[PDB]
Design an enzyme around this catalytic site. Sequence first.
Site, PDB file in Angstrom:
ATOM      1  CG  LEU A  74      -6.862  -9.761  -8.402  1.00 42.59           C
ATOM      2  CD1 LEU A  74      -8.504 -10.001  -8.076  1.00 42.59           C
ATOM      3  CD2 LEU A  74      -6.406 -10.684  -9.027  1.00 42.59           C
ATOM      4  NE  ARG A  83      -6.329 -21.232  -4.423  1.00 42.26           N
ATOM      5  CZ  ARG A  83      -4.917 -21.442  -5.172  1.00 42.26           C
ATOM      6  NH1 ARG A  83      -4.183 -20.835  -4.595  1.00 42.26           N
ATOM      7  NH2 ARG A  83      -5.089 -21.732  -6.521  1.00 42.26           N
ATOM      8  CB  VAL A  91      -8.085 -10.613  -1.769  1.00 41.91           C
ATOM      9  CG1 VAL A  91      -8.174 -11.328  -0.385  1.00 41.91           C
ATOM     10  CG2 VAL A  91      -8.725 -11.250  -3.059  1.00 41.91           C
ATOM     11  CG  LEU A 112      -4.847   3.676 -16.966  1.00 40.85           C
ATOM     12  CD1 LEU A 112      -6.213   4.084 -16.913  1.00 40.85           C
ATOM     13  CD2 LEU A 112      -3.885   4.809 -17.229  1.00 40.85           C
TER      14      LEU A 112
HETATM   15  C1  LIG Z   1     -12.782 -13.162 -21.293  1.00 41.72           C
HETATM   16  C2  LIG Z   1     -12.756 -12.223 -19.600  1.00 41.72           C
HETATM   17  C3  LIG Z   1     -11.558 -13.010 -18.941  1.00 41.72           C
HETATM   18  C4  LIG Z   1     -11.519 -11.669 -17.717  1.00 41.72           C
HETATM   19  C5  LIG Z   1     -10.482 -12.303 -16.614  1.00 41.72           C
HETATM   20  C6  LIG Z   1      -9.090 -12.290 -17.250  1.00 41.72           C
HETATM   21  C7  LIG Z   1      -8.110 -12.763 -16.242  1.00 41.72           C
HETATM   22  C8  LIG Z   1      -7.698 -11.764 -15.080  1.00 41.72           C
HETATM   23  C9  LIG Z   1      -6.578 -12.304 -13.991  1.00 41.72           C
HETATM   24  C10 LIG Z   1      -6.320 -11.038 -13.097  1.00 41.72           C
HETATM   25  C11 LIG Z   1      -5.353  -9.885 -13.598  1.00 41.72           C
HETATM   26  C12 LIG Z   1      -5.149  -9.076 -12.481  1.00 41.72           C
HETATM   27  C13 LIG Z   1      -4.562  -7.762 -12.906  1.00 41.72           C
HETATM   28  C14 LIG Z   1      -3.915  -7.120 -11.586  1.00 41.72           C
HETATM   29  O1  LIG Z   1      -5.153  -6.174 -11.062  1.00 41.72           O
HETATM   30  S1  LIG Z   1      -2.403  -7.002 -11.025  1.00 41.72           S
HETATM   31  C15 LIG Z   1      -2.694  -6.241  -9.586  1.00 41.72           C
HETATM   32  C16 LIG Z   1      -2.899  -7.633  -8.446  1.00 41.72           C
HETATM   33  N1  LIG Z   1      -3.247  -6.837  -7.054  1.00 41.72           N
HETATM   34  C17 LIG Z   1      -2.499  -6.890  -6.149  1.00 41.72           C
HETATM   35  O2  LIG Z   1      -1.116  -7.389  -6.100  1.00 41.72           O
HETATM   36  C18 LIG Z   1      -2.749  -6.209  -4.917  1.00 41.72           C
HETATM   37  C19 LIG Z   1      -2.201  -7.002  -3.561  1.00 41.72           C
HETATM   38  N2  LIG Z   1      -2.508  -8.428  -3.577  1.00 41.72           N
HETATM   39  C20 LIG Z   1      -3.744  -8.760  -3.327  1.00 41.72           C
HETATM   40  O3  LIG Z   1      -4.780  -8.566  -3.267  1.00 41.72           O
HETATM   41  C21 LIG Z   1      -3.686 -10.417  -3.335  1.00 41.72           C
HETATM   42  O4  LIG Z   1      -2.491 -11.066  -3.158  1.00 41.72           O
HETATM   43  C22 LIG Z   1      -4.229 -11.033  -4.850  1.00 41.72           C
HETATM   44  C23 LIG Z   1      -5.650 -10.655  -5.305  1.00 41.72           C
HETATM   45  C24 LIG Z   1      -3.479 -10.362  -5.892  1.00 41.72           C
HETATM   46  C25 LIG Z   1      -4.025 -12.563  -4.977  1.00 41.72           C
HETATM   47  O5  LIG Z   1      -4.795 -13.029  -3.789  1.00 41.72           O
HETATM   48  P1  LIG Z   1      -4.370 -13.947  -2.621  1.00 41.72           P
HETATM   49  O6  LIG Z   1      -3.039 -13.472  -2.452  1.00 41.72           O
HETATM   50  O7  LIG Z   1      -5.167 -13.939  -1.428  1.00 41.72           O
HETATM   51  O8  LIG Z   1      -4.382 -15.542  -3.188  1.00 41.72           O
HETATM   52  P2  LIG Z   1      -5.495 -16.514  -3.613  1.00 41.72           P
HETATM   53  O9  LIG Z   1      -5.383 -17.610  -2.613  1.00 41.72           O
HETATM   54  O10 LIG Z   1      -6.782 -15.674  -3.486  1.00 41.72           O
HETATM   55  O11 LIG Z   1      -5.287 -16.980  -4.920  1.00 41.72           O
HETATM   56  C26 LIG Z   1      -4.147 -17.388  -5.254  1.00 41.72           C
HETATM   57  C27 LIG Z   1      -4.180 -17.763  -6.843  1.00 41.72           C
HETATM   58  O12 LIG Z   1      -3.950 -16.289  -7.381  1.00 41.72           O
HETATM   59  C28 LIG Z   1      -3.154 -16.233  -8.452  1.00 41.72           C
HETATM   60  N3  LIG Z   1      -2.571 -14.673  -8.369  1.00 41.72           N
HETATM   61  C29 LIG Z   1      -1.910 -14.040  -7.303  1.00 41.72           C
HETATM   62  N4  LIG Z   1      -1.832 -12.821  -7.831  1.00 41.72           N
HETATM   63  C30 LIG Z   1      -2.275 -12.499  -9.233  1.00 41.72           C
HETATM   64  C31 LIG Z   1      -2.370 -11.692 -10.102  1.00 41.72           C
HETATM   65  N5  LIG Z   1      -1.978 -10.508  -9.747  1.00 41.72           N
HETATM   66  N6  LIG Z   1      -3.306 -11.900 -10.861  1.00 41.72           N
HETATM   67  C32 LIG Z   1      -3.690 -13.043 -11.434  1.00 41.72           C
HETATM   68  N7  LIG Z   1      -3.743 -14.231 -10.675  1.00 41.72           N
HETATM   69  C33 LIG Z   1      -2.884 -13.999  -9.355  1.00 41.72           C
HETATM   70  C34 LIG Z   1      -2.156 -17.114  -7.850  1.00 41.72           C
HETATM   71  O13 LIG Z   1      -1.041 -17.384  -8.994  1.00 41.72           O
HETATM   72  C35 LIG Z   1      -2.845 -18.307  -7.379  1.00 41.72           C
HETATM   73  O14 LIG Z   1      -3.276 -19.117  -8.517  1.00 41.72           O
HETATM   74  P3  LIG Z   1      -2.431 -20.524  -8.762  1.00 41.72           P
HETATM   75  O15 LIG Z   1      -1.167 -19.996  -8.988  1.00 41.72           O
HETATM   76  O16 LIG Z   1      -2.539 -21.184  -7.401  1.00 41.72           O
HETATM   77  O17 LIG Z   1      -3.171 -21.024  -9.950  1.00 41.72           O
HETATM   78  C1  LIG Z   2       2.630   1.028 -16.137  1.00 40.27           C
HETATM   79  N1  LIG Z   2       2.043   0.574 -14.447  1.00 40.27           N
HETATM   80  C2  LIG Z   2       1.051   1.582 -14.165  1.00 40.27           C
HETATM   81  C3  LIG Z   2       0.465   0.485 -13.475  1.00 40.27           C
HETATM   82  C4  LIG Z   2       1.402  -0.360 -12.794  1.00 40.27           C
HETATM   83  N2  LIG Z   2       2.015   0.471 -11.733  1.00 40.27           N
HETATM   84  C5  LIG Z   2       1.417   1.617 -11.263  1.00 40.27           C
HETATM   85  C6  LIG Z   2       3.458  -0.260 -11.320  1.00 40.27           C
HETATM   86  N3  LIG Z   2       3.432  -1.493 -10.948  1.00 40.27           N
HETATM   87  C7  LIG Z   2       4.706  -2.050 -10.422  1.00 40.27           C
HETATM   88  N4  LIG Z   2       4.756  -3.269 -10.251  1.00 40.27           N
HETATM   89  C8  LIG Z   2       5.986  -4.001 -11.049  1.00 40.27           C
HETATM   90  C9  LIG Z   2       3.850  -4.181  -9.595  1.00 40.27           C
HETATM   91  C10 LIG Z   2       2.480  -3.474  -9.689  1.00 40.27           C
HETATM   92  C11 LIG Z   2       1.706  -4.669  -9.933  1.00 40.27           C
HETATM   93  N5  LIG Z   2       0.749  -5.488 -10.392  1.00 40.27           N
HETATM   94  C12 LIG Z   2       5.815  -0.987 -10.531  1.00 40.27           C
HETATM   95  S1  LIG Z   2       7.525  -1.194 -10.014  1.00 40.27           S
HETATM   96  C13 LIG Z   2       7.599   0.634 -10.026  1.00 40.27           C
HETATM   97  C14 LIG Z   2       9.136   1.134  -9.649  1.00 40.27           C
HETATM   98  C15 LIG Z   2       8.844   1.763  -8.390  1.00 40.27           C
HETATM   99  C16 LIG Z   2       9.697   2.212 -10.754  1.00 40.27           C
HETATM  100  C17 LIG Z   2      10.117   0.069  -9.823  1.00 40.27           C
HETATM  101  C18 LIG Z   2       6.771   1.349 -10.553  1.00 40.27           C
HETATM  102  C19 LIG Z   2       5.534   0.529 -10.603  1.00 40.27           C
HETATM  103  N6  LIG Z   2       4.342   0.674 -11.029  1.00 40.27           N
HETATM  104  C20 LIG Z   2       2.343  -0.578 -13.936  1.00 40.27           C
HETATM  105 MG   LIG Z   3      -7.847 -15.399  -0.742  1.00 38.31          MG
END
Ligand SMILES: CCCCCCCCCCCCCC(=O)SCCNC(=O)CCNC(=O)[C@H](O)C(C)(C)COP(=O)(O)OP(=O)(O)OC[C@H]1O[C@@H](n2cnc3c(N)ncnc32)[C@H](O)[C@@H]1OP(=O)(O)O
Ligand SMILES: CN1CC[C@H](N(C)c2nc(N(C)CCC#N)c3sc(C(C)(C)C)cc3n2)C1
Ligand SMILES: [Mg+2]
Length: 411
Positions: free
Chosen positions: A159, A169, A161, A411
């Site tokens: 995921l 949002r 953005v 992963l």
């Molecule tokens: C049956 C099939 C079902 C399939 C779907 C299953 C669900 C899958 C769910 C996703 C699994 C993903 C697994 C991974 O990939 S985890 C890796 C997530 N990616 C990153 O951290 C990359 C860098 N960050 C960003 O790209 C953005 O900050 C993201 C996209 C993460 C949020 O964009 P942004 O910062 O521009 O915010 P917004 O205004 O658009 O949206 C705000 C809302 O988003 C909620 N939020 C923030 N982070 C996460 C997060 N990691 N999982 C779920 N929700 C998250 C937040 O609580 C708030 O909701 P609410 O608190 O107001 O309610």
């Molecule tokens: C098992 N994974 C591979 C994919 C995710 N990967 C690469 C991942 N995710 C992390 N966090 C908590 C946020 C990422 C999300 N969402 C961290 S923190 C970490 C240290 C450097 C050892 C502190 C390694 C790490 N690796 C987790």
């Molecule tokens: Mg947004």
Amino acid sequence: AHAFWSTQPVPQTEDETEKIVFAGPMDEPKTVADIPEEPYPIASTFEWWTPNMEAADDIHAIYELLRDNYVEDDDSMFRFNYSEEFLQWALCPPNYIPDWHVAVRRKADKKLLAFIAGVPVTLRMGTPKYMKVKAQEKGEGEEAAKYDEPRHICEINFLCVHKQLREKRLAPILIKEATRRVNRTNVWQAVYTAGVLLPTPYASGQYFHRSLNPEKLVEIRFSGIPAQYQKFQNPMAMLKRNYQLPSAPKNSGLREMKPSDVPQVRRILMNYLDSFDVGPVFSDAEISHYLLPRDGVVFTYVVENDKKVTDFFSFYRIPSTVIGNSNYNLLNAAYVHYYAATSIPLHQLILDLLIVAHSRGFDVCNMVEILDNRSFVEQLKFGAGDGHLRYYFYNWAYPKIKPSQVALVML
Ligand SMILES: CCCCCCCCCCCCCC(=O)SCCNC(=O)CCNC(=O)[C@H](O)C(C)(C)COP(=O)(O)OP(=O)(O)OC[C@H]1O[C@@H](n2cnc3c(N)ncnc32)[C@H](O)[C@@H]1OP(=O)(O)O
Ligand SMILES: CN1CC[C@H](N(C)c2nc(N(C)CCC#N)c3sc(C(C)(C)C)cc3n2)C1
Ligand SMILES: [Mg+2]
């Protein structure tokens, strides 16, 4: 508190999760015909795009989005830089569904602005062992066993953005569209992980790191020289000596995995993973895809004794951009993947992982405390990091479990 997550079929509080006794769905049963056939609405300046994750150029476009906009630490020191070959591997396993790769682009010029990806996984996600025992005590075994069959569900990852569009949002819209495309294929659960706390994990574990190249890790401030090393005339020298490894594997039968090993690796892995409450089930094709060696992506070794494979380990490569230090471009991390040991102690098997990773130029080995990973932490000199990986289900009630009862590597 959560304007999006409060509207979704997930447990809403920690208290709720601690009260769940049996695995099963949160929502009312629905049919595919109930689910909208049209994509979820999105602003007129944007359009939905389904990338072809088997076309080099579409992979490159997703690669660039993630390189510049994916997970970074809070201090903006490091940002994941998953390679193009890794993304093709992760997003196109056997029987993948192309429609589960969901992107948003700006209609005018078609810049890629956002992405989310789903892939199939077959998961054991029935009631955990501890809760089946209580249920037997109580005459409730039938309810506790209802969902024991491994289920064909969706795993979500990647995921993202674009930084310019944060906090608008958009992430909820990507989630809702992914949910719709999955539901249209008659799948109603997903599994996902995040480093952030959302409503509500069924399990959480700390990250652990093992330094392979301490001089580099200290230079880029991934690592600190710890305070006690200041008792020494040459702190850095003693740090290097602390983490020194053999230059050759110790286990004499160790070699890279080859296609003929797939059945035996599948057998010993599945016997091992069976012991955990949440875990994947893999076909021969999936063992082949996720474990055979792929250059720069996944590295897998077997111990072959008397011509039989008795043990194996795997690790995968995720480099990160080193944002602030100009002396180095990349952090090269090896992450512990699946393994199984039948002939030798796990610590002996995993020492050979660290030796191979170090020999191949990796800087650090990382893992979460899932599987039996805690069994070799101290001897092999891993240290806990400041982060946690939280495991979540969508539309699945599940008891809180310890991370050592989880066997799904993300992963
Ligand atoms: C049956 C099939 C079902 C399939 C779907 C299953 C669900 C899958 C769910 C996703 C699994 C993903 C697994 C991974 O990939 S985890 C890796 C997530 N990616 C990153 O951290 C990359 C860098 N960050 C960003 O790209 C953005 O900050 C993201 C996209 C993460 C949020 O964009 P942004 O910062 O521009 O915010 P917004 O205004 O658009 O949206 C705000 C809302 O988003 C909620 N939020 C923030 N982070 C996460 C997060 N990691 N999982 C779920 N929700 C998250 C937040 O609580 C708030 O909701 P609410 O608190 O107001 O309610
Ligand atoms: C098992 N994974 C591979 C994919 C995710 N990967 C690469 C991942 N995710 C992390 N966090 C908590 C946020 C990422 C999300 N969402 C961290 S923190 C970490 C240290 C450097 C050892 C502190 C390694 C790490 N690796 C987790
Ligand atoms: Mg947004």
